[PDB]
């Protein structure tokens, strides 16, 4: 009832002082989490501690499509051209989210090229030897030549300056866009109505012949 006043939809009316997570544990958690990565990196092998192979392409928000969210999707279709081999993939890494329908087949291009520029980097270590299909190399052994094991998975992306404010060559200037942009949307709105008019025109003709 204060005449510069800020209508207070501040809902602390329900004994909210019992709850309060003070978050005095933030860097204790950060230290623990980092410490845990150190344990995991050693424990799981010369295993490089993430990192599925990260699968992006194409998020769903029409605005939010450089908004890369990381490729858990498990790609049964994309496996095939990688030939590829769902079970074999799991030993390697291959994130098991079998429920995806990636039908924008530019998306099939990107991700298949990923797995292949990977895969050949998967140094093939089999538990005695003998070991079929490395297809590597005793010279090409993890320990001897290559020493790899990194990190964090780059969004890939691929800049964003953009600047496709390149030099084109730009012809289009007989092309009156503004009439067509309102027209295209109107055509879409009126599809069901335009369907009626055809149907009503058909009915009256049937009657007339009658």
């Amino acid at each position: 009832g204060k005449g510069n006043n800020m209508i207070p939809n501040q809902h602390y009316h329900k004994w909210w002082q019992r709850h309060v997570k003070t978050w005095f544990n933030q860097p204790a958690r950060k230290v623990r989490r980092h410490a845990n990565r150190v344990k995991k990196a050693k424990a799981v092998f010369p295993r490089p501690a993430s990192g599925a192979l990260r699968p992006v392409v194409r998020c769903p928000t029409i605005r939010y499509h450089t908004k890369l969210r990381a490729g858990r999707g498990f790609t049964l279709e994309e496996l095939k051209g990688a030939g590829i081999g769902a079970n074999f993939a799991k030993t390697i890494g291959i994130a098991v989210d079998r429920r995806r329908k990636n039908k924008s087949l530019e998306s099939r291009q990107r991700n298949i090229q990923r797995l292949k520029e990977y895969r050949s980097k998967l140094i093939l270590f089999p538990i005695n030897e003998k070991k079929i299909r490395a297809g590597e190399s005793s010279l090409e052994e993890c320990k001897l030549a290559t020493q790899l094991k990194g990190p964090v998975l780059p969004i890939k992306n691929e800049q964003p300056a953009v600047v496709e404010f390149r030099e084109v060559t730009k012809d289009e200037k007989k092309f009156k866009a503004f009439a067509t942009l309102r027209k295209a949307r109107t055509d879409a709105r009126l599809v069901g109505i335009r369907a009626k008019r055809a149907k009503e025109a058909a009915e009256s003709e049937d009657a007339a012949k009658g």
């Binding site: 005449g3 006043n5 953009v162």
Partner: protein, 149 residues
């Protein structure tokens, strides 16, 4: 940050009633808690100051997911700020291998808005949604709007 040494409540010791008037003493909730009664006692205070307080301007839109409508706006006031500064002077040149093709969509602005008056230099703007007026001044600058994914 804070000192209660800079508080005047410190200074008001003693001052017997601590700035809270001897006659009418500041006692817990003199006017009724909050926005109460906004149809009664604070009616002056609400239409003053918040007026549209109370009723309805109804068109209940059940499950507006603000991803369908989100549509952020760039003005034709600005629009040339999508072009990096050292390239901005570079296409004032005069040299044509042209016209200026700016991708508005990857700069995250769904819609190009009308606002008006750009330099006569032709701009092609790659944009999802159009102001017809933004296009009208762009076409006067001799560019176009090429309509864009």
């Amino acid at each position: 940050m804070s000192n209660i040494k800079r508080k005047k409540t410190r200074k008001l010791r003693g001052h017997v009633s601590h700035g809270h008037g001897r006659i009418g003493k500041h006692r817990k909730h003199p006017g009724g808690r909050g926005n109460a009664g906004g149809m009664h006692h604070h009616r002056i205070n609400f239409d003053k100051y918040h007026p549209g307080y109370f009723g309805k301007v109804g068109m209940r839109n059940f499950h507006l997911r603000r991803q369908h409508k989100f549509r952020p706006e760039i003005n034709l006031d600005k629009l040339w700020s999508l072009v990096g500064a050292e390239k901005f002077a570079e296409l004032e040149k005069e040299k044509s291998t042209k016209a200026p093709v700016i991708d508005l969509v990857k700069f995250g602005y769904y819609k190009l808005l009308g606002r008006g008056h750009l330099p006569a230099r032709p701009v092609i703007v790659k944009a999802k949604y159009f102001s017809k007026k933004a296009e009208d001044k762009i076409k006067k600058a001799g560019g176009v709007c090429l309509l864009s994914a």
